[PDB]
Amino acid sequence: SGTILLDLAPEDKEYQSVEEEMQSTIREHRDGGNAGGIFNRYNVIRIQKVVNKKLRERFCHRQKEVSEENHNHHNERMLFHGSPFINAIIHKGFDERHAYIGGMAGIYFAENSSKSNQYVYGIGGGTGCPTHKDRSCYICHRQMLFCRVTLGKSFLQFSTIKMAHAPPGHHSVIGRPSVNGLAYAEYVIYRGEQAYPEYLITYQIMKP
């Protein structure tokens, strides 16, 4: 792989920062918690920093190109990603060519941890955890990524993003919340090199 995983200690500001971002972005979802489960907070088991020389080279190369195409600003954002492919991603990086066989074009990120949690076991939560088939499992360890995402010039729309590529002049697409539209933001990129899987978070949802 070339990937090293570095464990962050709970007493480190960096761990605490990531956990705070995860905990403070939990929101109530319009499915009544069906996809991701019913919870008010997570139990964070472990937070690991993902290091891979080649993946970083690719991410930094693309970031420079995007910066050049966007008035010298790459417009990086930290965003959550949840999907059943976390293990592949930390070793091989993001690969947009897998967007079809996954269930979708595009790689999707959320600014709310709880939105990404809805997707960890699949679209709509799939059938939940492998062991108990429970989308609201309080026992099984879940994983999500908190990633660096190069957004460049973002195309904003108040509708669900279903495009094949970013529009001309843009590097990402954001589906924006509105009245009678989306409830939470979703961020899409169309090239794997525009995201780096920086933090791997292992966690449980907690029963209220």
Ligand SMILES: Cc1cccc2nc(Cn3c(=O)n(C[C@H]4CC[C@H](C(=O)NCc5ccccc5)CC4)c(=O)c4ccccc43)cc(=O)n12
């Ligand atoms: C509506 C919606 C809102 C907010 C978030 C959200 N998140 C997802 C996550 N998700 C997803 O992005 N895909 C497409 C990806 C294509 C890249 C692929 C990947 O990089 N694989 C790595 C790799 C490298 C080499 C070799 C093999 C593999 C990961 C999945 C999904 O297909 C997906 C599938 C199930 C659940 C969430 C998914 C979706 C979404 O609709 N979101």
Ligand SMILES: [Zn+2]
């Ligand atoms: Zn379970």
